[PDB]
């Protein structure tokens, strides 16, 4: 009934579903929600404003899947989970060790707080002798285990033992694996983190939010009050619904399916790029994404962002280890297997889509490549429709 | 329906939500029924679309057709998101607001209510001229009758304070023309796209001068919060499209036109509203001087079918958790279609059951009744869209 009323609206609509059939989203953070959890997020739910029934089946579901004792499913976003554990923890100017990709870089500013980090190896991974060396000499109030660019898996259980020596708490942030940790497809943060934030959506295909979990009750009533409003008289009940839905559906045997096919694609990718002599940052990745390497190539980690999209691959440019150039051109790119993988395409694809972005890197100015491979691209995609 | 076969859980409480709105008569005056067409926008695949666009640029056009504004700001996730980011892009630290009550680093400061129930401008003024404000806000949840903002911006003027209307729970009734427009007195103006907009849960910022819009504009800049929510925002343009229309305008005058004839039948039986009546898509109950309870009330007619809610009223004797006032909106069962006739026949069974308060055989009999007429109002035809 927005064909009737609405024409300028729906053909923005039909747009976007059209754009999102007609090109690969290989950017990692990006995926395509569950039809379910928009049912419920277009619901009269809207209409609802002490205990409701369904965010109580929202953490129920919460703590089966992510296996734990209390969980908070009202954040916004990722950003104001990792905040509000912040709020509910500490105390002004205290400090917090996170990670960034620098290689042996490392008092910074924070929202009122002072952010240290910790970085990686020679060979990209995570230099977890330098962290606890870094966090005896900065005793931080807390520890934050988790990023965005990191192709490799997080050793939940070595922070905290650096957080037990060091007096510390630790977060850990699976917004970008969560997928894989509710699946058994990676370390599980549980028992050796404190509190655990994430997002809903990206790997788990859920509606877009935040979630925070702990095992300590203590922790668990200072996250309820810190949290406090949403600054809104109603709890969102249809978003808080497809929360739910989408804590169903990856509960099911189908989803633990799904995070290894993830996972397979990357390695497909991973290899099909190194055969043709492609440099990732720590030589692969256990995850749901590599980080390509240009440090030693003619082209930027901007050139090739934008070469990949004129082929209709839209991915990230990304800094790396040992970063030679600018922030806003970088050395690197960061490409994703979720969203793909999402649509049914398996091994066979990955390969193809392996070897046409090696073939446009070693050739990054020819445009007319590009454009071969986006139309090749193309009918691959529509092969393999979304909804 | 995927939700059917894959969730029946969670389905079986979406279909108990929509069988509950049309089993019983819903009172509140910020509740109401969001356009089928906005839902259908919530649920669309702008979900998947991490990220200014067409969609938020159509948006903004509708806005400043539909508040006739030169300016307006659609990413606000609420009404008081929206006034706390006019609060963060006009004011330094330890400013001071002067804002309606019914008698960050900012101090807060209040007029009130004369003796008839109005609120006193002559006072309001007095406040202004001694507390010296930086800003001044209209907009009330709990008044029946319209803000003068005429005469807000002579208080704000002579001060040298900024006016800020909150339209929030009135903009049904302002976008139509069956309210005074807060412009162009008010210098900013904030409300929300539910209660009598009918559309989705969200906030919006208006103004016509251009150096406050690009305040607001960098005040939602870190206030983002990981978005933009494309289809909410998408969603926020069918509703303003929807109130374009001219069956709009006939809805908001049924809805003031539904509170004369129910404010009219309480009277007949004696009953007090404060104020005397309404201008309004709300009336409040005066039970000060009277044996029961506005959360008496509230209890008592929640459980005949009727959910209104508890509130203070101007010179309140009983507790803030009890009151002596029950407030009673029209616009939720305006947009069923529910007219005269059936707000007539709801006014004389409020009487029966507030002066009989605590019959509560008498309670669930009118809920018989009524959820009769109920069945015969229908609000949506389908759960999910």
Known sequence: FLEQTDSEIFELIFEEYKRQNEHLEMIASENYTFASVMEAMGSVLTNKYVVD???????????????????????????????????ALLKPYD????????????????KHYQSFSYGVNLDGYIDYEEALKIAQSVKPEIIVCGFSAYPREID???????????????????????????????????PHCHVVSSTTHKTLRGPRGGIILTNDEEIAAKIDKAIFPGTQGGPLMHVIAAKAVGFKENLKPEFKAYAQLVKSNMQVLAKALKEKNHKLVSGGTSNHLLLMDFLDKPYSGKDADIALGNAGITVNKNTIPGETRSPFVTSGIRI????????????????????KISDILNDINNVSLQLHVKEELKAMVNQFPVY
Do not use: W
């Open 156 to 190: 939940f259980k070595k922070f905290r033992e650096i957080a037990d020596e060091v007096g510390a708490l630790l977060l850990g942030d699976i917004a970008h694996v969560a997928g894989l940790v509710v699946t058994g497809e990676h370390a599980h943060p549980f």
């Open 95 to 110: 400090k917090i060790l996170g990670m960034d990709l620098s290689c042996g870089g490392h008092s910074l500013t924070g």
């Open 336 to 355: 994703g297997s979720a969203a793909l993988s999402a649509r049914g395409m398996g091994a066979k694809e990955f390969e193809i889509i392996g070897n």
């Open 53 to 87: 029934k369904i965010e109580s089946l929202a953490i129920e579901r919460a703590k089966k899947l992510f296996n734990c004792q209390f969980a908070n499913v009202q954040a916004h976003s990722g950003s104001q989970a990792n905040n509000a554990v912040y709020h």
